[PDB]
Design a protein around this nucleic acid. Structure first.
Ligand SMILES: Nc1nc2c(ncn2[C@H]2C[C@H](O)[C@@H](COP(=O)(O)OP(=O)(O)OP(=O)(O)O)O2)c(=O)[nH]1
Ligand SMILES: [Mg+2]
Ligand SMILES: [Mg+2]
Ligand SMILES: [Mg+2]
Length: 342
DNA sequence: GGGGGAAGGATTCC
DNA sequence: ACGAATCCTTCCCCC
């Protein structure tokens, strides 16, 4: 049958940083996202291991990071750089299969069935690539291998960091029975919690529960996903993905509900989006506001034709007035998101 | 009943 | 105390 090779760059934003200024290596590095409300407001996007050991990981506030690691190095996130670096490395991989699916910015799936014969020869294609990237770009990555993508990826979770690990058919079997259901991709907290209830601690526990009861609990897509996966037969292919929407959301120096002080931030959002669209022309537009108590409200609109920048400016204002109208809370973060490209 | 599709919220992290 | 794919629920027009 089939073999998939999953590739995941290690602590990616932090590592492109150690590469551009090697002096940093060995020290605690933290790439931040300074929301600019007050010195050090914002969360951490990621940090190298020489700093993640103390709990400083993606998500925690930068103020909390400084209390733990007062003297670590804090850099702001430079997306475009990390982005052009990922692109280079993605090419490098095509020179191994042109059946490549690019998941996110730091990971890819390769279908190496027509280039390899077995897990012994695959492991080698594996080691070979890491080298081709540690030499060409200087970035270490982890590599997972197995039958379907899910497992290939789970393989990389275990081999992190700078690892490579194969998961052969005997392994699948034991994992389907031993692996913790929460460690299966696409199963965040809200779902693991809903599974505990139904009494499903493992992937296998799904073969002993009335499907229609499962469906109502977590949804049908998840039910079929999990069930087939457990029945040892998940096999979705490696298709090339495309950008389906682009957007930008920004944080205001302070809360508000005054359509006048909000307009500026909103046009910045729209501006940064239309630039980072390029060529592409959207038929749908949405406005998104994050209320004072961290909840999200959104209002959109689809047009029979594409949207001109000038129209974006105008429809964003209506949708924003629709939000402020139907909601009492103050708005904290405001932005836009374009979808349905022609 | 049931397709087709748009809206707005929920969930994930890839 | 910081971008986006996918899916679910709901509403709706129409045959
Ligand atoms: N802004 C922001 N960026 C995030 C967040 N989580 C992940 N990222 C970004 C920055 C990470 O470098 C990039 C790759 O994510 P990974 O999950 O693979 O983690 P990273 O590679 O940082 O560590 P890893 O070696 O995989 O354990 O995704 C987040 O919560 N906020
Ligand atoms: Mg990674
Ligand atoms: Mg990743
Ligand atoms: Mg999980």
């Amino acid at each position: 049958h089939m073999i998939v090779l999953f590739v995941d760059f290690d602590y990616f934003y932090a590592q492109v940083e150690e590469v551009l200024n090697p002096s940093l290596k060995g020290k605690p590095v933290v790439v931040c996202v300074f929301s600019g409300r007050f010195e050090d407001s914002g969360a951490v996007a990621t940090a190298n291991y020489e700093a993640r050991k103390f709990g400083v990981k993606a998500g925690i506030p930068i103020v909390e990071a400084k209390k733990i690691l007062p003297n670590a190095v804090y850099l702001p996130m430079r997306k475009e750089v990390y982005q052009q670096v990922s692109s280079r490395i993605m090419n490098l991989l095509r020179e191994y299969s042109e059946k490549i699916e690019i998941a996110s910015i730091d990971e890819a799936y390769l279908d190496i069935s027509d280039k390899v014969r077995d897990y012994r020869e695959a492991y080698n294609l594996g080691l070979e690539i890491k080298n081709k990237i540690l030499e060409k770009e200087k970035i270490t990555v982890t590599v997972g291998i197995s039958k379907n993508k899910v497992f290939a990826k789970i393989a990389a979770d275990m081999a992190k960091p700078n690892g490579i690990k194969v998961i052969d058919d005997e392994e699948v079997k034991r994992l389907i029975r031993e692996l913790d259901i929460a460690d299966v991709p696409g199963i965040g907290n809200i779902t693991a919690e809903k599974l505990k209830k139904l009494g499903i601690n493992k992937l296998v526990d799904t073969l002993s529960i009335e499907f229609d009861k499962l469906k109502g609990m977590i949804g049908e897509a998840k039910a079929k996903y999990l069930i087939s996966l457990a029945r040892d037969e998940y096999n979705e292919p490696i298709r090339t993905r495309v950008r389906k929407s682009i957007g930008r959301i920004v944080t205001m120096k302070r809360n508000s509900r005054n359509l006048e002080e909000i307009k500026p931030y909103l046009f910045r959002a729209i501006e940064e989006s239309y630039y980072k669209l390029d060529k592409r022309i959207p038929k749908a537009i949405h406005v998104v506001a994050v209320t004072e108590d961290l909840d999200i409200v959104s209002r959109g609109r689809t047009f029979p034709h594409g949207i001109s920048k000038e129209t974006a400016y105008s429809e964003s204002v209506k949708l924003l007035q629709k939000i402020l109208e139907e909601d009492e809370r103050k708005i904290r973060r405001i932005g836009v998101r374009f979808s349905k490209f022609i």
